[PDB]
Structure formats: C-alpha cells, structure tokens
Design an enzyme around this catalytic site. Sequence first.
Site, PDB file in Angstrom:
ATOM      1  N   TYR A  58      -0.237   3.490 -10.033  1.00 32.99           N
ATOM      2  CA  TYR A  58      -1.299   2.535 -10.388  1.00 32.99           C
ATOM      3  C   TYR A  58      -2.291   3.054 -11.437  1.00 32.99           C
ATOM      4  O   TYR A  58      -2.891   2.268 -12.146  1.00 32.99           O
ATOM      5  CB  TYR A  58      -2.070   2.064  -9.131  1.00 32.99           C
ATOM      6  CG  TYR A  58      -2.585   3.191  -8.288  1.00 32.99           C
ATOM      7  CD1 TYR A  58      -3.900   3.630  -8.403  1.00 32.99           C
ATOM      8  CD2 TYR A  58      -1.750   3.841  -7.369  1.00 32.99           C
ATOM      9  CE1 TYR A  58      -4.380   4.692  -7.620  1.00 32.99           C
ATOM     10  CE2 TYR A  58      -2.197   4.901  -6.591  1.00 32.99           C
ATOM     11  CZ  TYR A  58      -3.514   5.333  -6.719  1.00 32.99           C
ATOM     12  OH  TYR A  58      -3.968   6.378  -5.927  1.00 32.99           O
ATOM     13  N   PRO A  68      -5.225  10.147 -12.931  1.00 33.40           N
ATOM     14  CA  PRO A  68      -4.814  10.364 -11.532  1.00 33.40           C
ATOM     15  C   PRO A  68      -5.993  10.408 -10.616  1.00 33.40           C
ATOM     16  O   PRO A  68      -6.954  11.073 -10.923  1.00 33.40           O
ATOM     17  CB  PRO A  68      -4.126  11.723 -11.579  1.00 33.40           C
ATOM     18  CG  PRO A  68      -3.747  11.889 -12.984  1.00 33.40           C
ATOM     19  CD  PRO A  68      -4.828  11.273 -13.788  1.00 33.40           C
ATOM     20  N   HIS A  69      -5.924   9.692  -9.502  1.00 30.42           N
ATOM     21  CA  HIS A  69      -6.999   9.672  -8.523  1.00 30.42           C
ATOM     22  C   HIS A  69      -6.443   9.049  -7.248  1.00 30.42           C
ATOM     23  O   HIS A  69      -5.392   8.397  -7.282  1.00 30.42           O
ATOM     24  CB  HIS A  69      -8.240   8.913  -9.032  1.00 30.42           C
ATOM     25  CG  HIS A  69      -8.021   7.433  -9.191  1.00 30.42           C
ATOM     26  ND1 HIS A  69      -8.434   6.518  -8.247  1.00 30.42           N
ATOM     27  CD2 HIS A  69      -7.371   6.721 -10.148  1.00 30.42           C
ATOM     28  CE1 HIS A  69      -8.080   5.306  -8.632  1.00 30.42           C
ATOM     29  NE2 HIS A  69      -7.420   5.404  -9.773  1.00 30.42           N
ATOM     30  N   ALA A  70      -7.136   9.295  -6.130  1.00 28.36           N
ATOM     31  CA  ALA A  70      -6.857   8.644  -4.834  1.00 28.36           C
ATOM     32  C   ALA A  70      -8.110   7.992  -4.241  1.00 28.36           C
ATOM     33  O   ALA A  70      -9.223   8.096  -4.789  1.00 28.36           O
ATOM     34  CB  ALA A  70      -6.253   9.636  -3.835  1.00 28.36           C
TER      35      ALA A  70
END
Length: 151
Positions: A58, A68-70
Amino acid sequence: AMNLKQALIDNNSIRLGLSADTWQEAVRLAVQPLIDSKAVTSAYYDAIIASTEKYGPYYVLMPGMAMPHAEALGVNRNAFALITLTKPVTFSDGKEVSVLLTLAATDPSIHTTVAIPQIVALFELDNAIERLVACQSPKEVLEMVEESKDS
C-alpha cells in the site's frame, strides 16, 4: 511535529546506493537507519512486513518510490529515513522501487495530514528518482529536500 529535512538530519537517516534482491531486503535496509538512530525497534520492520502481507504494498504510491510504514509499534519517536537503491527492486504487486522513504509515527493521522504532503512534494520535482539515485552524498539529498519546500 515534523519537517522532513530536519527529521532526516536529526536521525542522520540518509543512505545512498544500497543493494537489495527482494522487497523484503529493501524494507529491512530502509528501516535500519531508524533503528541506528534509536527512533524505532526491529519490531517496526516486522510490523511493515506483516502489514504488507495482509494489505499488499500500500505504501508504494508513485513510480520508483515506497514510503514504508505500519500502523503504529516499535516506534518511540517521529522520524523519516531515506535510502537509495542501486538496482530497482520489485514489490509483490509488480511495482518497481528505487527509492524508499520510511516513515515512523507515534500518531496515525500524521501520515496524511503531515507526512505524505511532504513526501509528495519531493517526488513531484522534475526527474526526482533518478536525480535521487545519482546523489553522491546526504548533503545533496538534503538540498533536494529544501528545494521541495517552495513553489
């Protein structure tokens, strides 16, 4: 809350011309500089891999870049990192990435109100990814980032 240039300096977050074979390799390398600066923990890398596994890639928003990450988790401090790949890596949706701008936050609404607008601006610069790939030192990466803030 957060300025991309400053964040990158405070964390000494820029890495240049690294090499990865999988998109998992590239994510690891992209989060590392933030473990180096103690902004995040490995459990943050894990959380990126896991969210990619359930949601797909995503954070790969524009050609040649991932941020990039959560939804966070292993995070002590808001931070950005910036890495540059020698050779484009292919994410699980078929998209090819050469530049990863990792984003970490302790509050989830930062992402769209604060972070994405800044990231968007850097990449909305005339020939950004290749310019970024040909950067020879964090100095000029940071110079590109100042160039982002205006016009």
